[PDB]
């Protein structure tokens, strides 16, 4: 997919700062939620990342659950050039 690099930057940076996406299956919608970009290339970008081996996908009731695996974290950190001591929001020990 041909994604302008700034919208792809938004996608990658959001996926990193928290770690998960839902991405309703309905294409052609104007804006994906909490991303302010088109849902279509959100879905396609996470599909490409999964094909890489960085995002585990899970389709159920059209809501494309996305989760970031460790090599995904490393790849995003190298791409986002953010310091190597910050982890996505999932890794935070928000336990019981």
Partner RNA sequence: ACGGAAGGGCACCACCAGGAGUGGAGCCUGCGGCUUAAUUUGACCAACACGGGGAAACUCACCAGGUCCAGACACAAUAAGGAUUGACAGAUUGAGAGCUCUUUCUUGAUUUUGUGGGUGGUGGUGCAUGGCCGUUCUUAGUUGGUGGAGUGAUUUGUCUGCUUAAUUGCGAUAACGAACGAGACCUUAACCUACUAAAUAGGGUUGCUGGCACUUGCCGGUUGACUCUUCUUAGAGGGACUAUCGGUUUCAAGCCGAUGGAAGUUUGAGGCAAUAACAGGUCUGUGAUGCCCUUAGACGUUCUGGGCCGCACGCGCGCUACACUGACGGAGCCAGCGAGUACAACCUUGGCCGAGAGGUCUGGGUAAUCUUGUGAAACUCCGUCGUGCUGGGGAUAGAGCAUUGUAAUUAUUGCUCUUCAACGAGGAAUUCCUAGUAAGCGCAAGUCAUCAGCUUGCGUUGAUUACGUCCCUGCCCUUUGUACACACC
Q: What 3-state DSSP class applies to 18?
A: helix
Determine which residue in the list 13, 24, 35, 57 makes contact with RNA, applying CB under 7 A.
57
Is residue 18 at the binding interface for another protein, with CB under 8 A as the rule?
A: yes
Q: Please report how close the Cβ of residue 87 comes to RNA at its closest, in angstroms.
A: 24
Q: Please report how close the Cβ of residue 37 comes to another protein at its closest, in angstroms.
A: 16
- In the block, which residue shows the tokens 């104007």? 30
Pick from RNA, another protein, none: which does 20 bind, CB < 5 to 8 A by kind?
another protein
């Amino acid at each position: 997919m041909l994604i302008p690099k700034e919208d792809r930057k938004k996608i990658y940076q959001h996926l990193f700062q928290e770690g998960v996406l839902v991405a309703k299956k309905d294409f052609n919608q104007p804006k994906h939620e909490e991303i302010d970009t088109k849902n279509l290339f959100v879905i396609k970008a996470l599909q490409s990342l999964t094909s890489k081996g960085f995002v585990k996908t899970q389709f159920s009731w059209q809501y494309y659950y996305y989760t970031l695996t460790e090599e995904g974290v490393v790849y995003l950190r190298e791409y986002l050039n953010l310091p190597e001591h910050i982890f996505p929001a999932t890794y935070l020990a928000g336990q019981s």
